[PDB]
Design a protein around this motif. Structure first.
Motif, PDB file in Angstrom:
ATOM      1  N   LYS A   3     -28.562 -75.002 117.481  1.00 56.30           N
ATOM      2  CA  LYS A   3     -27.931 -75.162 116.176  1.00 56.30           C
ATOM      3  C   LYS A   3     -26.812 -76.194 116.226  1.00 56.30           C
ATOM      4  O   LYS A   3     -26.616 -76.951 115.266  1.00 56.30           O
ATOM      5  CB  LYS A   3     -27.419 -73.814 115.678  1.00 56.30           C
ATOM      6  N   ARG A   4     -26.070 -76.253 117.334  1.00 57.34           N
ATOM      7  CA  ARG A   4     -25.017 -77.261 117.435  1.00 57.34           C
ATOM      8  C   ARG A   4     -25.597 -78.673 117.434  1.00 57.34           C
ATOM      9  O   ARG A   4     -25.056 -79.581 116.779  1.00 57.34           O
ATOM     10  CB  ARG A   4     -24.174 -77.026 118.685  1.00 57.34           C
ATOM     11  N   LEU A   6     -28.352 -79.618 115.998  1.00 54.61           N
ATOM     12  CA  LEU A   6     -28.772 -79.895 114.625  1.00 54.61           C
ATOM     13  C   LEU A   6     -27.581 -80.271 113.744  1.00 54.61           C
ATOM     14  O   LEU A   6     -27.672 -81.187 112.909  1.00 54.61           O
ATOM     15  CB  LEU A   6     -29.505 -78.681 114.061  1.00 54.61           C
ATOM     16  N   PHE A   7     -26.455 -79.575 113.911  1.00 55.36           N
ATOM     17  CA  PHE A   7     -25.274 -79.902 113.117  1.00 55.36           C
ATOM     18  C   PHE A   7     -24.806 -81.326 113.383  1.00 55.36           C
ATOM     19  O   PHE A   7     -24.433 -82.053 112.448  1.00 55.36           O
ATOM     20  CB  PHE A   7     -24.141 -78.923 113.408  1.00 55.36           C
TER      21      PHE A   7
ATOM     22  N   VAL B  46     -20.101 -72.502 114.335  1.00 59.48           N
ATOM     23  CA  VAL B  46     -21.062 -73.591 114.196  1.00 59.48           C
ATOM     24  C   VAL B  46     -21.865 -73.430 112.914  1.00 59.48           C
ATOM     25  O   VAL B  46     -22.172 -74.413 112.229  1.00 59.48           O
ATOM     26  CB  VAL B  46     -21.975 -73.662 115.432  1.00 59.48           C
ATOM     27  N   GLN B  49     -19.769 -74.649 110.032  1.00 60.64           N
ATOM     28  CA  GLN B  49     -19.696 -76.108 110.013  1.00 60.64           C
ATOM     29  C   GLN B  49     -20.993 -76.714 109.495  1.00 60.64           C
ATOM     30  O   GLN B  49     -20.973 -77.684 108.725  1.00 60.64           O
ATOM     31  CB  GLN B  49     -19.375 -76.644 111.406  1.00 60.64           C
ATOM     32  N   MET B  50     -22.134 -76.159 109.909  1.00 58.03           N
ATOM     33  CA  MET B  50     -23.417 -76.652 109.420  1.00 58.03           C
ATOM     34  C   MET B  50     -23.493 -76.541 107.905  1.00 58.03           C
ATOM     35  O   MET B  50     -23.887 -77.492 107.218  1.00 58.03           O
ATOM     36  CB  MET B  50     -24.559 -75.871 110.070  1.00 58.03           C
TER      37      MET B  50
END
Lengths: 50, 51
Positions: A3-4, A6-7, B46, B49-50
């Protein structure tokens, strides 16, 4: 971790668009220069403070 | 009576063994829980933030 990553991917596109539309703001407001080193916004001067 | 006392002594020895194993297991659990809580916090951050 997935997920990090992707962000970070998304933030890249965000900054890309930011600069994209900041480049179009020069179509409205030009900052110019001449040999005497005076500066013009839309053709009108703006010397330094002093 | 002597046999019973000897059996009790061996039982006490095994109890000490079990206690030591419990202490080791509890240390491991402490470390794991530390990591788990930290991971949950980072996951939520996270995700925000996304969004």
């Amino acid at each position: 971790t997935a997920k990090r990553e992707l962000f970070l991917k998304t933030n890249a596109q965000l900054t890309i668009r930011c600069r994209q539309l900041l480049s179009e703001l020069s179509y409205i407001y030009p900052i110019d220069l001449n040999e005497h080193k005076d500066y013009f916004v839309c053709g009108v001067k703006l010397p330094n403070s002093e | 009576r002597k046999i019973v006392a000897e059996n009790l002594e061996k039982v006490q020895a095994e109890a000490e063994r079990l206690d030591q194993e419990e202490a080791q297991y509890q240390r491991e659990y402490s470390e794991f829980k530390r990591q788990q809580l930290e991971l949950d916090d980072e996951l939520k951050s996270v995700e925000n933030q996304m969004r």
